[PDB]
Subunit: 259 residues, 5 copies
C-alpha cells in the first residue's frame, strides 16, 4: 500500500465514540464484570480453569462510513476507565481489613491494555504452564509444548471474537500489528493498589514515525481492551477478578492509497 | 455556536476564588468532614448503605458579572486541598499501629477529583454491585440492572445538587462534558498513603486543542470536587472516610460567540 | 506598580542560612525530637502538650537597608541538612525483628519551605475541633465543627518561631501573593523517607509576570517544616524527628511606586 | 577505526527481528522458564548453587548480510518482554495469599536487562560472597578473593555463550562496551511487584553523542538480555525464579569505515 | 580567582575513569563490603557503635597531568553502581522469607551519593544522637552538644581521608562546596527495595549556570561516593549493611584562570 494525500473537507473527517465492556467470566446473572472465585490446582498437570474463572480480551469491530483507494486513517485516541469510583464500594460482602474495619477494596494483579487498529489485533501465545487444560468456548494455544512457557511461534491468533481469548494465554504479537497501535501495563503482586487517572484533556496520537495512523481495511475500526482492575475479596476470603469498561474516542480522516 | 474574538481591555478579565467543603457523611454534629463508621453487608442482596456512610460530590455554581453574544470563558485554574497538615493529628482516639505506638493516620482508598465547567458536570452511573439499595435523600442510578455493574446508558445525570450524588455510583461521563475540563485520581488499596502536594506557583491552563476554555452559560461557573483522603481508624478499629476542602482560583475573560 | 530592575554596583545580594526544626525538645538531650505520642481515648479529651507538637519554623532576615527601591527574591536553593543521620539504627531502636537492626525513622512526614517579602499567611484547619492546644502555642481560636473543613475566622501570620503547631495551620491560598510556598505531606505509618541532596538545583521565585517576592521593610521571610517521620524506641513509643533546612536566596534591586 | 559517511538507497538499510528466551535453569522437561526451587546454604563457605538453580544471561549472535569497507550500524531498538499476561495464572499449584484466596503471583527481586552491540557484551565480575562454589557448565569469576565482593579487575569476560554466564556473578563492564548500548534495572525486595509495559510505539535511539551507533564486526549483531520477572511460590512454599522471553527489532544502516 | 577561556586542541582534553570501593566496616577477612551485624544500644547515653559496624564515605584524590594559570575543569560525569546483580545471591546464609522460601534479598535503608570536585568534599556534621561515642580511627563531630542533633556550625571538615568519615555523622556542607557538584538520595524505611539502574548512555554535565565545571587545584580531582544498598539478613536474623563499588568516568579540559 502506497499512502498518499489526506483528503480535506468536512466530509473527510469522522469520529467513533464507544464503551468496551469487560469480559471477566460472569459466573452468575448478578455478577457481570466479575469472574468465578479462583480455585488453585494441586499440581501443574491438573491445572484446569473453567471459562467463568478466566478473564478474556474485549474487542469491538466498528463499521465506518462506506468509501468505495480511499481508507479511513485513525489519527487520535482519547480513552479512560469508566466507573473508577465504584472501587470505593467497601461495604458490600467484603472481608474486613481487620476487626471492625471496612472491606478490602479491589487490589492485586491488574492488566490495563488498549489497542486501535485497521484490522484485528494480532496475538502470540505464552503459557505460564503449558499443561494447563483451557476450557471449551475459549480460543487458546493448541499443541502446547514446554517451549510454549517462554516462546513457541506456532501460537499465532487474531483477536477476531469477543469473550473468547483468555488474557493469560495471549499478548499482542510484536512481530506484527504494523496496522495497530497497542498500549499495555501488567502491575503484578497480591496487594498492589489500583491507580486510575480520568480526564477529558489527554489525547494520544496514533500516527507512526512517518505521519501515518492505522488504515481501516473494509471500512472497519478495531478497538481492543482489557481492564482487570485486581481482585475482589468476599467475606469467605475467596477472590474474584473485577473489571471495568473502557471509553474510546477515535478521530479519523480519509487517506488516498494505491494498489 | 461559533466562537469569535476575545474582548480586550481591563474590564474584560474576572477572577473567581472559593472553597468547596467536602460532603463525607457528617454522622453527628462534631464530625463534619468524617463519614459514619463503615458497616459491611453480609451479602450483595442486603447491601444498604445509610446516607451518613456515603461520601458525595461537592459542587458550587458561582454567579459571574452579567453580559447582556458575550460569554465568560474560563482560562486558568489554581487548586489545592486545604488543611493537609490536619492529617498529622495521630494523637486523637486513633488505633495504635503497635503496642505503645502513635495513632494510625488517615490512609487507604483515596479519590481526588476537580472540574471547572460553563455548566453542571455530566455524570455516567456505574455500580460496584447493582442490587445495592441507595438511601433516601441521595440521587443515584435508577432502574439498575446487572449491566449497571459494567456499563448502562440509562444512568445519566447532571451534578446539579450538593451533598446528593454519592461518589461510589457516579463518574464524569466521557461521552459529554465538552464544555467542562475534569481531572481525578482513584488511589486504591487499604494501606496506600496520602501524597498531598501544595503550592501557589502551579497553574492549569483550561483551553482545548482550539484555544477555547469552558464558556459559562447563564453567566454561571461550575466547580465540582471530591477529596476523599483515605480512612481514619478509631481505637475500636472501625473506619471513617475523612475528606478536606479544595481551593479554586479561576481566571475568566470575555469571548464573543454566534 | 513594579518598575525597572537596577543594575551595576551593590545591585545584587545573597542570603544563606539554616532553619532548625521545632519538634518539641522534651528534655535538654532531645533537641529535634518530639515527646512520645500519647493518644486520647476520645475526640473530646484530645489535649496534646506543647512538647508533643511540631511547629512551623521561621526567620525574618534583615537585608541591606535601601531608601521606591525594594529587594526582590529571584532564585532559591534549598535542602534538608543531615539526611544521613537517619542511618543510626543502633541507638535505642525497636528491632525490626529478633536480632535485627533498629527501625529507621519512618511514617507521616511534612516537607515545606517558603520565601516571602512578608510573613507567610496561614489558614487554620483542625482534624478535631475539640482538641485542647497547649499554652505557649498559637492555634485556631473559637474553633467550631466547621473548623474541621474550613472556618474563615482562623487567619494568622507565621510571625513567631516554636509557636504555630504544624497540625493546625496551612498556607492560606486566598493570600500569600508576596510569598512562594511548596510543601508535601506523605502520610502513612510505614511510609519510607525519600530525601534528595544536591547543590546543582535552583528554584525560580518569579511569577507569570517576571516578579518575585518584594521585601517590605527590607526583610526576607524564610519558613520551613521538615518532620522526617517518627523514631520508634525499644519501648514502642514514637517521637517526631525533624532536621534543619538550608536556604540560599539571590535578591536584586527593583524600583516600585506608591 | 575512522567512521565516515552513511550509504543511502533502498538497499542501504536492513532490519533484525527476533526473540531471546530466558535461561532460568529449566530444572526438568516441564519447567522451561523456571529455576530449581531455591536452597539456602547454612554458611557462606557452604554456598554451592547448582546449575539448574542459577539464572544466566541470554545471548544471540545474529549474522547480517555480508558486505566486504562498510559495516552495519545499529540505529534504533524496539524491545518488550513477551508474555507479561502469563503472570495472571494464579490458579496453578500456587500458595494461597490467605485461607480461600487466589495463588500468590510472581513477585520479589527482578532484573530486566537488554543490550545491542557490534560485538559480545563486556562483563565485569562481582560476587555477593567470594567463596561461593559455582557449578560445572557455568562460566564464572575464577581466582576469587575477598576483594571480588567489591571490585577485582581480574574478573573480565565476553558474553559469548548462552545458558552459561550466571546473572549474579557478572555485570556490564563500564570501562569497556564502547561498541554496545546496555540498559538494566535491578528491583530487589521480597514482595516487590512486577511492572511490565508493552507498546509498539516506543523506539530507543542507539546513536552516541557523535551520531554513531554500534558497528557490527564480522557482520554480526549481538543481542543480550535478562528478564527474571520475580519468583513463583508453589503450594509447598518453595520458590523458583520465573523468566520471560524478550523481543528485539533493530534498524541497521550501512556505514563506511577505515581500518 | 577570575575564570577566562577554555583551551582547544587534541591535548587540551583528558579523561579519568576509576572504581571507588565501599567502606562498610569489613568485620572479618571474608566480608569485604559488609559491615559488622548491627547492635542496638539500650539507651542514647550508651550508643557506642564500633568502627567495623559504621559505613564511611569513600574518597579518591586522582592526580591529573601536570600543567604549570591553567587548571583542569571537570565537564561531564558518567557513574554507575558495579555488581547490582550480586543482590540476586539469595541462597547464601539468608533468613528465609517464609517456610521453604528463598532468602530475603538486601533491602531497607539505602544512601546512594557521588560527588566530583576540584578540592575535597566539604562536610557539615549532624548527629542523630549527640551522646553517641564514635570509635577510635574514625573522624566525627567533636565537642558535640544537643544542638549538634539539628545544626552545630562547629562541625566542619574536608573529606580528605578514606574509610574515616562515618556516613551517619556527615553530609555535604551546602554553605560551601562551590568547587564541587554533589548528588545524593537517602531512601529510608526498614523493608525499602533497592532500585538500581545501569546504562552506558547517561551523562551528567558538571557545568554550573555560568558554564564553569569544577577547577582542580594542584592538578588533583576528588571523587567521593557512598552506596549503602541496604541490609543483609543472615539466618540468625542479625543484619549487616552491604555496599557496592561505584564507577566514575570524568571528561576534563584546560581552562585559563588568573591570581
Amino acid at each position: 500500500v502506497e499512502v498518499l494525500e489526506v483528503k480535506t473537507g468536512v466530509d473527510s473527517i469522522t469520529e467513533v465514540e464507544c464503551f468496551l465492556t469487560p469480559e471477566m467470566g460472569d459466573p452468575d446473572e448478578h455478577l457481570r464484570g466479575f469472574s468465578k472465585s479462583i480455585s488453585i490446582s494441586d499440581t501443574f498437570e491438573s491445572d484446569s480453569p473453567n471459562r467463568d474463572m478466566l478473564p478474556c480480551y474485549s474487542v469491538a469491530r466498528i463499521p465506518l462510513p462506506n468509501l468505495n483507494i480511499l481508507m479511513w486513517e485513525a489519527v487520535t485516541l482519547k480513552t479512560e476507565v469508566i466507573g473508577v469510583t465504584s472501587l470505593m464500594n467497601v461495604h458490600s460482602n467484603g472481608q474486613a481489613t481487620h476487626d471492625n474495619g471496612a472491606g478490602k477494596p479491589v487490589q492485586g494483579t491488574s492488566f490495563h491494555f488498549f489497542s486501535v487498529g485497521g484490522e484485528a489485533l494480532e496475538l502470540q501465545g505464552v503459557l505460564f504452564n503449558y499443561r494447563t487444560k483451557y476450557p471449551d468456548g475459549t480460543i487458546f494455544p493448541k499443541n502446547a509444548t514446554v517451549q510454549s512457557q517462554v516462546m513457541n511461534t506456532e501460537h499465532k491468533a487474531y483477536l477476531d471474537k469477543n469473550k473468547a481469548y483468555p488474557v493469560e494465554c495471549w499478548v499482542p504479537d510484536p512481530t506484527r500489528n504494523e496496522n495497530t497501535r497497542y498500549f499495555g501495563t501488567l502491575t503484578g503482586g497480591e496487594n498492589v493498589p489500583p491507580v486510575l487517572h480520568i480526564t477529558n484533556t489527554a489525547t494520544t496520537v496514533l500516527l507512526d514515525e512517518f505521519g501515518v495512523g492505522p488504515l481501516c481495511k473494509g471500512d472497519n475500526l478495531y478497538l481492543s481492551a482489557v481492564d482487570v482492575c485486581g481482585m475482589f475479596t468476599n467475606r469467605s476470603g475467596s477472590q474474584q477478578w473485577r473489571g471495568l469498561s473502557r471509553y474510546f474516542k477515535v478521530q479519523l480522516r480519509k487517506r488516498r492509497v494505491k494498489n
